[PDB]
Each structure stands twice: as C-alpha cells, then as structure tokens.
C-alpha cells in the first residue's frame, strides 16, 4: 500500500474458556495486521511548512519597532496556523483518547505565537513612551540600558 507498510502479520486460534461450547463466540481465528504509516506525504506537505511558519514568528524580536510591522507578522503567523488546524481537522477522527502529535505541536505553537503577540504589544508600548506620557526612573535605566545589554552582549 502507498501509505502503509506491514510490520507483523500473525494468525491465531482464539478460544474463550469461559464461553459455553454451544455458543458461536467460543471459537474464532483472527488474522492481525500491524502496519506502519509512511509519513513522507504528511512531512512534506504539512509538517515542514507548518513548523517553518511557526518558527518564523521569532523574527519579530529582530524587527525594529520603527518598522511598524511586528504585530502584523505575528498575527499573520497565527492565522496561518489556524488554516493548518482547519486542514488537519478534516483528516483525523474526533476521538478523546489522546491529542495527536501534530495537534500537540499546533496547540503549542499557537500558544507561543499568542505570547509573542503579547510581547510585541508590550515592547511597542515601551518603545513609544515620551516624557509627557511616562516617567523613566533611574532604576529602569540602570537595568535595561547598562546591565542587561552588558549581560546580553548587545552591540
């Protein structure tokens, strides 16, 4: 099969000791198929685009606040992840035994992108402060302009 490879293929005669002899459920012969999915299609067409697009959101921290395009990038990444979730919702059953691995990654990436959008909002809020609106205390200056830049090895 184009998507499944057979790993094991046993056969067994199953007899229920508790069932009566005159029951049809006493005996059966079962043939099992252990099959492994070949994930190349899903890899190429879903996972690499989705993972790359999700990782792309980290670029907003290297975007200057003067570009005026950070939150747009982040929310667009969230929209793309939503489209991927729409794509994946049509391919699996709506069962409750477990969250699929792709679903786990999509939820994780969406939570992280939401956090990134919030961080971008906070950073932009800090960037556009002026004397007429906010007061820049000396402790804030000492921390964020002399201490952390030295620790973070910024240019």
């Amino acid at each position: 099969n184009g998507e499944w490879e057979i790993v094991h293929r046993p056969a067994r005669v199953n007899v229920d000791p508790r069932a009566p002899l005159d029951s049809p459920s006493r005996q059966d012969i079962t043939f099992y198929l252990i099959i492994r999915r070949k994930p190349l299609f899903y890899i190429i067409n879903i996972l690499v685009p989705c993972v790359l697009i999700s990782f792309m959101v980290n670029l907003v921290f290297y975007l200057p606040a003067d570009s005026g395009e950070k939150t747009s990038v982040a929310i667009s990444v969230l929209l793309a992840q939503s489209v991927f979730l729409l794509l994946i919702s049509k391919r699996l059953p709506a069962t409750s035994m477990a969250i699929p691995l792709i679903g786990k990654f999509l939820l994780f990436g969406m939570v992280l992108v939401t956090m990134v959008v919030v961080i971008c909002v906070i950073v932009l809020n800090i960037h556009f402060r002026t004397p007429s609106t906010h007061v820049l205390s000396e402790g804030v200056k000492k921390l964020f302009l002399e201490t952390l830049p030295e620790l973070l090895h910024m240019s």
């Binding site: 994930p39 067409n45 670029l59």
Partner: protein, 268 residues
Amino acid sequence: HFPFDEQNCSMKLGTWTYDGSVVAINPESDQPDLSNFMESGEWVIKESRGWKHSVTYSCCPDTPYLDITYHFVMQRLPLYFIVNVIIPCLLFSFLTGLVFYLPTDSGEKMTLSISVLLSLTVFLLVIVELIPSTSSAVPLIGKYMLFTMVFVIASIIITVIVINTHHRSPSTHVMPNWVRKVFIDTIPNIMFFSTMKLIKHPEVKSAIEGIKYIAETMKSDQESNNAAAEWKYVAMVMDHILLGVFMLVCIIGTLAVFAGRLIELNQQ
C-alpha cells in the same frame, strides 16, 4: 512526474478454479478492442497489448496455470494542473522576489512578503486536495510547491535582516570596517554605483552660549545622519543583490524542477 506522468495499468484474467489441463484460455487478438472506446478528458491511451502467460510449478509439471494480462500504457493530460496549480505557484514565486526592490522606508516589505505567504497557505488547501496522498515518492508538483514555500520563508527571514540593517544608527551600532569595505567599496564597483557613496549681562551671555549650543547640536545631528545614511546604503546594496539572487532562483528552480520531464516528453 505528476502531472506529466505516464502509467502502465494491467488487468490479469484467468479461470479461478480450472487449470490449463482442463480449461485453456487463448487471446482473441493481440490487442484489446478499442473500436468503441469513449474519449477520456484526463488520459490518453498510448499503447495497449494482451499477453498470454503459462506457469508450470516444479511440483506439478503436467498442470499449467494460465492467464491473459491486458496492459494499457496511458498518458495524463496535464492542462488542468498546469492552469489551476502550476501558474498560481509561479505567480507567488515571482512575487516573492519583488520585496527586495521595495524601499525599507515604504514600511510595506513585511506586508508584501507575509501576504504572499498567506496566499500560499490558502493555496495549500487546493494543493492537498488535488495532489496524490501516497508516500512512495514526492510528486513533482509537490516538490515545486515545497520549493516555493521554502524560498518565500527565506525571503521573509532575509528581509527582516535587511530591515534591521536599514534602521541601525550610531545610537545603537558602529559600522565594522569589513562591512564598509565589502558593501560600500567593493560590491558597487561590480554594480551600477549611480548612487552617493556689556557682556556682563547674564542674558546676552546666555544667548551667545545658546546659539553655539544649537550649532553644536545640529553638527552632531548631521554626523549621526551621515552614519545612518551609510547604514541605509548598505541595506539598499544588500536589497539589490538579493533581488537579483531571488529572481534568478525563481527562474532556475522552475526550470530545474520541470524542464527535465518536459524535455523527456518532447523527445517522444
């Protein structure tokens, strides 16, 4: 080679419970009868042929097992996939490179690149439904779409780097000497380069010192403006190089994907 693929589909027919020593089957003709064949709007049957096969197992030398296999070699008609799939992907690939000719000061590079990415993501919904879902090999059209996605994402990354470079100032950075030598001196020489690169009164005393303060302030501002202009020029040079590189990548990737199979089909 999808959608420029050729298939070889067979129909093996035989008597299920009779062997060749009780019932013998022979072909009526060397080919299937196609005199009453309705035209297909998706496939062209290039060749058709029926072969009889007889198998004798070593255990039973007097009992042949017979079959007749009719095979059809068929060629897909690719116009539907060319129009609906390949051309939009080519348009997105072309649009990918245009960001590197957009100025940074426009404030719209991220808009262009991200919108191309969103269009490609929406186009994924057509791709997945119109592409085979097998894992024996990657479809050629799927290779092209993965190519386009990878290089639009690369364009976004490099555009973020370019925008970061454009906005650098002496208040945050100092130009390394290697950056100057590489981008302002050597590269433009292999490029067009048509681009630059009584008094005791406190009040009169205060006025004189103030006028000097204004003059010094704008001298410093002009120096910082020149440094920022150097950074912006470096960004523009990188943008021009990247425009050339990405347009070249678009053309060469499209050809390197399709031209092999298209030339193979032209020879036949």
